[PDB]
Amino acid sequence: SMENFQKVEKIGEGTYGVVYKARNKLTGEVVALKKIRLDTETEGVPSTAIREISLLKELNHPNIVKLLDVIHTENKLYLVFEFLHQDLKKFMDASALTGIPLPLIKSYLFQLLQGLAFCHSHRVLHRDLKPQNLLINTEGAIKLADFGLARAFGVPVRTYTHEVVTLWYRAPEILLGCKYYSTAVDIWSLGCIFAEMVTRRALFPGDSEIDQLFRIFRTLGTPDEVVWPGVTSMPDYKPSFPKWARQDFSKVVPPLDEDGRSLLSQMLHYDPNKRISAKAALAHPFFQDVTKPVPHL
C-alpha cells in the first residue's frame, strides 16, 4: 500500500487521474504515482488501465516509461512509474519564446522513433502520441508514456476503435473513416510533433473532425486517386471538398534542411501503405550524426 511510498506533491492530473511525485521509503528512489480510483468506476478496473498495465509489463525499452509496480489499496490502484521531470507540451510552451534548439530536435525525434519501432515490433499501437504524453528528464532522454489509449494489434488486424489520437495529431485515414488502420497512424503523429517542435506551433490545429481534415489539405494538398488510391471511396470523404495545393516545405517548416523536409514529408505521406515506418525512419540520412544534449529546465 502507501506504506512503502511517501507522497511529496501532486504534480498533474492527466485524463486518467492524478499524478503524484513520491519517494520509496526503503531506497529513497523518487517515483511518479498515477492514481486510478475504483469506487468511481461502475465497470471496475478501467479497460484503459488494464491495457496500460499489461502492455507496460511486456515493454521494457530505454525510450518507454518504466512501470515499476502496481499497488492495490482501499478502492484505488496506484501505478508506480519511473520519474521524469517534464512533458514535451509544457517544455515547448516554456521554450516557445526562443523555439526549441535544433540539435535537441534531432535527438528527441530520433529517440521517439526507437521507442516507437520497439512498440511496433511488439505489435503495439500507441494511438496517442501527443507532446503532453512524451516525458523528458534532465539527462536528455525522452520516453513514451500513457499507454492507456494503446492497443496490441493482431495479425491480421480488425477494425479497431475509431477516433483515436488527439485530434491535432490524428492521421487522415482515421479522419476519412478507413476500415483498418495500423502502424502508420503513429508515424503521422510523430510527423505532426516533429514539425510542431520546429515551428513552435502545432502543425494542424484543427478544432473539429472536418476542420482537422482541411488543415491537412491546406498544407499537403488535397489528395486524389493518384497520390492515394482508393481515397475518394472512403466513407467520410465528400466530393465537395476544396482542392488545395501542396506547399513548399521551406514555407511550412523554414528551419529545416533538405534531409528534414525529406524525412518529414515521408512521415506525412497520405497513403498509409507508402508512409515510412519507424524502422526505416531511423535509417534516414537525417540521423547521420545524432546527438544527446541536456535541456534547460
Next chain:
Amino acid sequence: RGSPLPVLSWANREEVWKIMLNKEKTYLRDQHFLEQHPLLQPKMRAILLDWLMEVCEVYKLHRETFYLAQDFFDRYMATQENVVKTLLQLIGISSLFIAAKLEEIYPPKLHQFAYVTDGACSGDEILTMELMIMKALKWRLSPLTIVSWLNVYMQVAYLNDLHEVLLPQYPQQIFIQIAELLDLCVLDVDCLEFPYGILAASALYHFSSSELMQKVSGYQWCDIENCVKWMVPFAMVIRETGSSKLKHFRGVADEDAHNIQTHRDSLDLLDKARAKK
C-alpha cells in the same frame, strides 16, 4: 524452427518472430493444474468453458476474447488451490469480463456479465474476482491465444503479391472449420500439454496437409507429432458431425462474421472424442 512471416515493412520480421516465440515461452500452462483442486473434475472445466463460449455468442464477442478468457482461467487456477465447484462460474465470468474489456471496442457492461449468471454472481462479486485474477496473474494479460496463432497461420497461407500481412486476406470457411476443432479440443484440459501454436498448427494440419502446416508455421513434423496424434479422435468427431456453417450476426458485417465466437452444445462430442482413446 523457421520464420514463416514475410518481409514486413513496419518491423524486421526476424525480431517480430523472436518476440512472439519468447511470448509463448514465458506464458506457462499446466495440464495437471486440477490436481491442486481435488474436489474438481476436468468435466467441470469443460462445462465452464463451453458456457463461456455460449455467452460469447449471445453478446457477439470475438473468438480472441473467448480464448483470452480461457487462458486467464487456466492460468489463474494454476495459481490457486482447493477451489470449490460453486466458485467456477464466478472465476469464468470474471475472466471473460477482463478479456472483453481488453479486447472489445464496446464490451458488454458489468450488469450483463452478472445477468447471464442468473443471480449466481453479482456485479460486486465480479469486481472482487477480477482484481483477484489480475493480481494473481501479475497483470500478465497479453498471451498469444490459440486462435491468434490460427489467424497468423491463415494470413501466411493466403499471402498474395502485396505481402501486406496486416490486412485480412484469408477465406472464412477454412478459418471457422479449424476454429471449430480447436473449440472442441480446448474443452479437454489435456490440451494444455501442448503449446498454443502447436495446437493451432495441429488442428490446421488435420484440415489440410503437412506441406501447408510446415509452410505457415515453421514447425517440423516431429514438433507437432504428439499433438496431432492426441487430436486424431477430436478431428474424427468433428468430421463425423460435419463442420458448422457461417453464422450471421446483427450489426456485424458478413465479411467480419468469422471473427465472432460461436457455440453449439459440445459436451457429447467431447465425451465421444475422449472415449476413442
